Amino acid sequence: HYYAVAVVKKGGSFQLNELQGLKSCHTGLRRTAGWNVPIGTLRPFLNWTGPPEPIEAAVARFFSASCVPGADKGQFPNLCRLCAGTGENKCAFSSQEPYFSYSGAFKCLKDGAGDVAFIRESTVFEDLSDEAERDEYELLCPDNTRKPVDKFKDCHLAR
Amino acid sequence: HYYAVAVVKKGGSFQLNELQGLKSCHTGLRRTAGWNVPIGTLRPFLNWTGPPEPIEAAVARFFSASCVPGADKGQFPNLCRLCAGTGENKCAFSSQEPYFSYSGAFKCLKDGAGDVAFIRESTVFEDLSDEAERDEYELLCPDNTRKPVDKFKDCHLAR
Amino acid sequence: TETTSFSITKFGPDQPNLIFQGDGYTTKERLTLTKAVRNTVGRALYSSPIHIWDSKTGNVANFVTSFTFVIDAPNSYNVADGFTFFIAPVDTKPQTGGGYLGVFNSKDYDKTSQTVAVEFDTFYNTAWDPSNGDRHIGIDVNSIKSINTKSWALQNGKEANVVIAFNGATNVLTVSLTYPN
Amino acid sequence: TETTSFSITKFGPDQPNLIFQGDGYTTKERLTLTKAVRNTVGRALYSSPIHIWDSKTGNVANFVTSFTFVIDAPNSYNVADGFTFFIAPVDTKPQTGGGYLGVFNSKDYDKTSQTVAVEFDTFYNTAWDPSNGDRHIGIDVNSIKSINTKSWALQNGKEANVVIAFNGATNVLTVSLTYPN
Amino acid sequence: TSYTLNEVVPLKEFVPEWVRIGFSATTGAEFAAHEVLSWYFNSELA
Amino acid sequence: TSYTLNEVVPLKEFVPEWVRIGFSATTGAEFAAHEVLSWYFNSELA
Ligand SMILES: *[C@@H]1O[C@H](CO[C@@H]2O[C@@H](C)[C@@H](O)[C@@H](O)[C@@H]2O)[C@@H](O[C@@H]2O[C@H](CO)[C@@H](O[C@@H]3O[C@H](CO[C@H]4O[C@H](CO)[C@@H](O)[C@H](O)[C@@H]4O[C@@H]4O[C@H](CO)[C@@H](O)[C@H](O)[C@H]4NC(C)=O)[C@@H](O)[C@H](O[C@H]4O[C@H](CO)[C@@H](O)[C@H](O)[C@@H]4O[C@@H]4O[C@H](CO)[C@@H](O[C@@H]5O[C@H](CO)[C@H](O)[C@H](O)[C@H]5O)[C@H](O)[C@H]4NC(C)=O)[C@@H]3O)[C@H](O)[C@H]2NC(C)=O)[C@H](O)[C@H]1NC(C)=O
Ligand SMILES: *[C@@H]1O[C@H](CO[C@@H]2O[C@@H](C)[C@@H](O)[C@@H](O)[C@@H]2O)[C@@H](O[C@@H]2O[C@H](CO)[C@@H](O[C@@H]3O[C@H](CO[C@H]4O[C@H](CO)[C@@H](O)[C@H](O)[C@@H]4O[C@@H]4O[C@H](CO)[C@@H](O)[C@H](O)[C@H]4NC(C)=O)[C@@H](O)[C@H](O[C@H]4O[C@H](CO)[C@@H](O)[C@H](O)[C@@H]4O[C@@H]4O[C@H](CO)[C@@H](O[C@@H]5O[C@H](CO)[C@H](O)[C@H](O)[C@H]5O)[C@H](O)[C@H]4NC(C)=O)[C@@H]3O)[C@H](O)[C@H]2NC(C)=O)[C@H](O)[C@H]1NC(C)=O
Ligand SMILES: [Ca+2]
Ligand SMILES: [Ca+2]
Ligand SMILES: [Mn+2]
Ligand SMILES: [Mn+2]
């Protein structure tokens, strides 16, 4: 089992509320811990007028620029702008997008492109298996508290 | 008996032909030797389109500025411009216009206002009864020759 | 009778018979005032000044205007700020931006302006809008807080055929905005 | 359809909807081009540029003009120089004075000018006027020596009601000068 | 649908004899596109 | 009396798309007064 968490770097601060404007790291369309869940607790700040406006479109402006694999870089040229995918793999869903899926999306946080990365409360640790760096990251908890990765049991968005 | 003559000063020269532009001294409306005769041998250069344009009007432009006693200074403000008549006697026909009639008109030539003065071939002499000045004046003759006052018998316009 | 009349159908890329000030320019056969961004002023006003009244005989003018404009916003929940047809002194230039539609400068009446305009506002302003939010049409005159404002539906993105004609004899202007249906 | 139209009756002392260049100004309810003197240029051309054709669709325009002008000279035997209605590039200014009516500069065709005009000349010019003196009307186009000139009576001082309308479909202009009778 | 307004406005009293007429829109800390597709205007003074 | 002229003038070929129209007179080593009393002008492009 694994919960949902909002993973951030370290160097200045803010909270889930202040999100608007920032650059996000995603795993891919509808990938739960990198979208489904995030979009849930963000929806209120989206001002999304429902259909037929794509709920993606709403989050397409709210976030200054990001990487959401499988995103129409032709209509929403911004859900892909941060995508490390040099080539036709830009914003790709395949593995040719170094920031595709969990680790990649988290690695999007590592190279200072994104500020918040929605990747499972397991990745980051598994990823940065080095003591210091493990201490060099924060985690946004639903109650707008920036609790540490180790505290994910509490600092988790949805179950 | 007395003929008609065109009396001029001295200091540079020209001839009856070159008249256009100059400032004239007259005796008064229809006064023969100061108008009737002059207007006769000038008519050709007047471009006077006949009636109802006043033949005065034609000569009103041809001469840069003059003194013609009895001239409508309201419609032809130029047949009077040289008139020495300080006051309501400006361009007057009375004797209140120092340049009215023969001597006056000639005296218009004396104070360098006019360049040609149509005054009888008797006036000038009678007027300037001093040897030198008598020599200081010229006379336009019909055959475009600037013959001296003493030669008026020849240098006369009409009889 | 003094009479000036012009009818523009396709605002070509060169468009000489107008004056563009601030941003505003022609585009795909259309005059553009603001390119859907943050904090920009747009206004275009025909080149020949027209004379409305006669001081020589205190006679006011009759005038009609018809135009199909469009306000298409990226989000139907965050429009701004407004579109307005103004009449003002020949030597006129972009006044305060933001929610003043670039023609006025004070909520309060400032006689000096000498500007009567019809405004189609799309962003409520507590300080001077009918407290109920409602987007609306209004008739401005030296203020910003109109003398009359009637609430109206945006139809974000649809063409809109409007027309306004004042009455010289009756000193009465009428504005009608009709969304094709 | 693009359409501009203006009708001026009393050229007031202020007169904004025009451009006066050289001398020319308004006066007693009238536009004056030259004040009956020696060597002066006068021209006034309405402020809004009009577009005649369409490069986008090689379509020429239909246009009509009507006006009552007057040439009153002090002497009916020494008139000069001329009055002309010209059409020229927006950025246009007084060209050679004298007998060029301030619109052209060479007797010879100079394509560059881009000026077609109707001229009412009142002073024969050996170098380029129909050798018979005769004052006349003419249709100028990049020269001064028209392509057509028809002799006519001055009526020095009388009002004259003229009107000229070109044909877009037929590319034909017609000028008629009528002295009220 | 149509939306209309009528109001007695003593023009003479408010705006000069000579006036230029124009279109003007703006955008603040929010926005939208403003575009004009056509234009008519005929004014006669007696 | 009336005096008239008709001549086929291919306008498009000679003067620009955008043109200002005007009145202009002059005076040389001779003169006369030139004055305009009214003016009309309606131009439609298809
Ligand atoms: C998601 O949706 C929500 C909700 O949307 C709203 O509701 C829907 C139904 C729609 O109607 C929609 O239109 C609504 O917004 C969005 O949240 C809302 O977002 C808007 C847009 O930003 C906010 O509105 C802004 O409010 C700003 C702050 O207002 C306060 O401060 C003002 C003075 O600074 C004061 O005038 C206000 O009254 C207010 O002050 C107090 O506020 C409290 C609490 O609200 C009240 O209780 C008090 O009553 C009130 N007054 C007092 C005396 O207490 C405004 O600054 C901002 O105005 C600017 O934009 C609007 C047009 O959009 C113009 O009308 C203004 O003229 C102005 O334009 C220009 O704005 C820029 C930016 O400020 C200025 O430039 C900068 O100014 C700086 C100032 O220091 C610097 O000087 C800098 O150098 C300079 O460049 C220009 O100068 C300025 N021009 C002029 C001429 O002024 C605007 O009105 C809503 O407040 C906000 N809702 C809430 C509850 O906060 C959300 O954004 C939306 N999007 C997303 C992505 O989620
Ligand atoms: C009384 O009536 C008579 C008769 O009237 C005539 O007939 C009636 C029916 C009417 O039609 C009426 O219109 C007629 O005039 C009046 O006498 C006549 O008066 C006029 C007006 O002055 C004279 O016409 C002038 O001729 C001048 C000289 O022409 C000769 O020289 C020219 C070059 O300099 C040349 O182009 C001419 O062709 C001619 O040269 C040769 O002449 C011989 C003998 O005639 C011929 O056999 C040859 O064929 C001929 N060519 C050759 C190659 O041999 C012109 O200068 C003068 O032109 C100016 O005015 C007219 C409009 O009035 C414009 O069309 C011109 O553009 C020009 O305008 C501007 O004029 C001024 C003044 O010159 C210039 O400014 C000055 O120029 C100076 C030059 O050095 C300086 O540079 C100075 O700094 C500068 O300020 C401007 O630059 C100039 N602008 C331009 C663009 O050029 C005009 O055409 C008649 O010739 C004369 N009749 C006779 C037989 O002489 C009489 O005046 C009238 N009034 C009174 C009160 O009695
Ligand atoms: Ca507003
Ligand atoms: Ca000529
Ligand atoms: Mn309002
Ligand atoms: Mn000619």
The full DSSP string for chain C is: -EEEEEEESS--SS--SS-EEES-EE-SSSEEEE-S-SSEEEEEE-SS-EE--BGGGTBPPEEEEEEEEEEE-S-TTS---EEEEEEEESS------GGGTTT---SS--GGG--EEEEEE-S--TTTS-TT---EEEEEESSSS-S-EEE----TT--EEEEEEE-TTTTEEEEEEE---
d(CA D155, CA F1) in angstroms, rounded, equals: 11
Give the position, in ligand 1's atom list, of the atom nearest the Cα of E30: 63
Give the position, in ligand 1's atom list, of the atom nearest the Cα of C123: 13
Residue D11: CB partners within 8 Å, gap ≥ 6? D18, D26, D27, D29, D30, D31, F36
Going by the annotation, the residues of the binding site of C for Mn(2+) are: 119, 121, 129, 136
Distances (CA, A) of B5 to A78, B34, B113, B156, D74: 105, 9, 19, 5, 31
Gap from F26 CA to chain C (nearest CA, Å): 26
| Ligand nearest to the CA of residue C98, numbered in listed order | 1
Binding site membership of C21 for ligand 1 (Cβ less than 6 Å): no
Residue C115: CB partners within 8 Å, gap ≥ 6? C86, C87, C88, C89, C92, C103, C104, C140, C141, C142, E14, E15
Residue A102 assigned ligand-binding role: yes
Question: Maximum Cα–Cα distance for chain A, whole Å?
Answer: 47
| Ligand nearest to the CA of residue B58, numbered in listed order | 2
Could you tell me the residue range of the domain that residue D176 belongs to? 1-181
Binding site membership of D138 for ligand 2 (Cβ less than 6 Å): no
Q: Is A101 helix (H, G, I), strand (E, B) or coil?
A: helix
Binding site membership of F29 for ligand 2 (Cβ less than 6 Å): yes
d(CA E3, CA B8) in angstroms, rounded, equals: 90
Residue with tokens 């803010």: A14
Does B47 touch chain D if contact means CB atoms closer than 8 Å?
A: yes
Final resolution, Å: 3.3
d(CA A119, CA A105) in angstroms, rounded, equals: 7
Q: Is B56 helix (H, G, I), strand (E, B) or coil?
A: helix
Distances (CA, A) of C64 to A84, A146, C5, D5, E42: 57, 62, 9, 14, 6
d(CA A99, CA C79) in angstroms, rounded, equals: 35
CATH assignment, B1-159: 3.40.190.10
d(CA B69, CA B27) in angstroms, rounded, equals: 7
Are chains B and E touching, using the cut-off of 8 Å on CB pairs and a minimum of 3 such pairs? no
Binding site membership of E30 for ligand 1 (Cβ less than 6 Å): yes
Answer positive or negative: Cα dihedral of D155, D156, D157, D162: positive
Q: Is B62 helix (H, G, I), strand (E, B) or coil?
A: helix
Q: Closest residue of D to B58, CA-based?
A: D75
Binding site membership of F9 for ligand 2 (Cβ less than 6 Å): no
Contact A49 C74 (CB under 8 A): no
d(CA D101, CA D41) in angstroms, rounded, equals: 8
Are chains D and B touching, using the cut-off of 8 Å on CB pairs and a minimum of 3 such pairs? yes
For residues C143 and C106, the answer to whether their CB atoms sit within 8 Å is yes
What is the number of H-type helices and E-type strands within chain A?
6, 5
Are chains D and A touching, using the cut-off of 8 Å on CB pairs and a minimum of 3 such pairs? no
Residue B1: CB partners within 8 Å, gap ≥ 6? none
Token pair listed for B49: 């389109």
For residues E7 and C171, the answer to whether their CB atoms sit within 8 Å is no
Token pair listed for C124: 């409520």
Token pair listed for C143: 């203020």
What technique was this entry resolved by? X-ray
Task: State in Å: Cα D137 to ligand 6 middle.
Answer: 7
DSSP A30-80: T-GGGTHHHHHTTHHHHT---TTS-HHHHHHHHSSSEE-TT--TTT-TTSS
CA C92 to chain CA mean position, Å:
14
User: What is the CB neighbour count within 10 angstroms for residue B84?
Assistant: 18
d(CA D55, CA D78) in angstroms, rounded, equals: 46
Does A17 touch chain C if contact means CB atoms closer than 8 Å?
A: no
Q: To test the ligand 1 pocket, which listed residue (C40, C78, C135) has its Cβ within 8 A of the most ligand atoms?
A: C78
Question: How many domains in chain C?
Answer: 1
The neighbours of chain B, by the rule of 3 or more Cβ pairs under 8 Å, are D
Count of C-F CB contacts under 8 Å? 3
Binding site membership of D82 for ligand 2 (Cβ less than 6 Å): no
Where residue D120 sits, what CATH number does that domain have? 2.60.120.200
Token pair listed for F14: 């000679």
What residue type is B111 in one-letter code? D
| Ligand nearest to the CA of residue B21, numbered in listed order | 2
Domain boundaries, chain F: 1-46
